[PDB]
């Protein structure tokens, strides 16, 4: 899986194909964070295969649909439990992020896990995602935004329009 663009949360339901022994096999569900649905179904078969004697040939996808964020206009803290392979082992991690959508927090996770650990998305298995209350957060980087009277300036504002004009008579100002 390539963590291309902002990921989406998918609800994927599958089962074993019915057989004479078990005319109605049980249904299984998974939360899949993927770029599109075609990827979402592929990763489902990769996870259920790891947990059950199942695979695409001997099973079917009963339902694939996007799970929309329930409060996209509200700030939340997310706790993400994941395991990943490094160059020399496998590790479990718990990470926290502040976002508006759960799929956004997961996308932050992939970009962050790539930045801080050189982890490609094919080695990362997100186990669990939960919305966490400000009192239950552990990471100091997230907790410092739990401040009802938060305030801070924007020092040394870098000039981003550096080629319009390309040549100018006046030097830029970084204080605003």
């Amino acid at each position: 899986m390539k963590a291309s663009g902002t990921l989406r949360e998918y609800k994927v339901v599958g089962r074993c194909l019915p057989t004479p022994k078990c005319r109605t096999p049980p249904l299984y569900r998974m939360r899949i964070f993927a770029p599109n649905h075609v990827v979402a179904k592929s990763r489902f078969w990769y996870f259920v295969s790891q947990l059950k004697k199942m695979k695409k040939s001997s099973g079917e996808i009963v339902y694939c649909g996007q799970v929309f964020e329930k409060s996209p206009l509200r700030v939340k803290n997310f706790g993400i439990w994941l395991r990943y392979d490094s160059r020399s082992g496998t590790h479990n991690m718990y990470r926290e992020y502040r976002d508006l959508t759960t799929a956004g927090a997961v996308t932050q996770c992939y970009r962050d896990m790539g930045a801080r650990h050189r982890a490609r998305a094919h080695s990362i298995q997100i186990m669990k995602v939960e919305e966490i209350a400000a009192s239950k957060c552990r990471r100091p980087a997230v907790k410092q935004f739990h401040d009802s009277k938060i305030k801070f300036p924007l020092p040394h504002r870098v000039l981003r329009r550096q080629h319009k004009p390309r040549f100018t008579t006046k030097r830029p100002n970084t204080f605003f």
């Binding site: 000039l159 550096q162 390309r166 040549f167 100018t168 008579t169 030097r171 830029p172 970084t174």
Partner: protein, 199 residues
């Protein structure tokens, strides 16, 4: 016609890349105060970089090159020459459209100097990063005219300060004049405000 740039506070490589493209497109460029140019990285590691360059010489006849120019103007000139196809007639013609100076000699001393915000150190370097001065670097690899350039740059600035004070004197009069003739120019001032030329 001629694009005059101020070398103070600019990063060597970034300015050269922009200056190299301008002279390839056919524009005449003058860069002044090449000793004011900056290089990212602490001074010592930039000094080492040039001392390694000084070691490059034809073992059998050092007079045959490379030539290691010690002036900040020539160091910058050779940097721009490194971003041009200077072994073709096109590249050499472009290289002739660039003039490089230490300090600001005439006639550029009495002309407005442009900057290149894409090459400005304040724009391109995080404020915590160390940087080097091309003038100090050049002086410490054999440049002989650091003190004289500074002495003459101190005389120019004293003259520039006098010129500015005269300009401020003339602007104070201008604002006073706009007040004395406020009634005679009111109709023309509404035309400008109507069309944004005066806020």
């Amino acid at each position: 016609q001629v694009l005059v740039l101020d070398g103070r506070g600019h990063l060597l490589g970034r300015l050269a890349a922009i200056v190299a493209k301008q002279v390839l497109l056919g524009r005449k460029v003058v860069v002044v105060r090449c000793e004011g140019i900056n290089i990212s990285g602490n001074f010592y590691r930039n000094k080492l970089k040039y001392l390694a360059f000084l070691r490059k010489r034809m073992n059998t006849n050092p007079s045959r090159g490379p030539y290691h120019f010690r002036a900040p103007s020539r160091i910058f000139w050779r940097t721009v020459r490194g971003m041009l196809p200077h072994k073709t007639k096109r590249g050499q013609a472009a290289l002739d459209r660039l003039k490089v100076f230490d300090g600001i000699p005439p006639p550029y001393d009495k002309k407005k100097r442009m900057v290149v915000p894409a090459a400005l150190k304040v724009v391109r370097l995080k404020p915590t990063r160390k940087f080097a001065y091309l003038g100090r670097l050049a002086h410490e690899v054999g440049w002989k005219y650091q003190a004289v350039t500074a002495t003459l740059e101190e005389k120019r600035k004293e003259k520039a300060k006098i010129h500015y004070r005269k300009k401020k004197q003339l602007m104070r009069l201008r604002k006073q004049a706009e007040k004395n003739v406020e009634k005679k120019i009111s109709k023309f001032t509404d035309v400008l405000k109507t069309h944004g030329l005066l806020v």
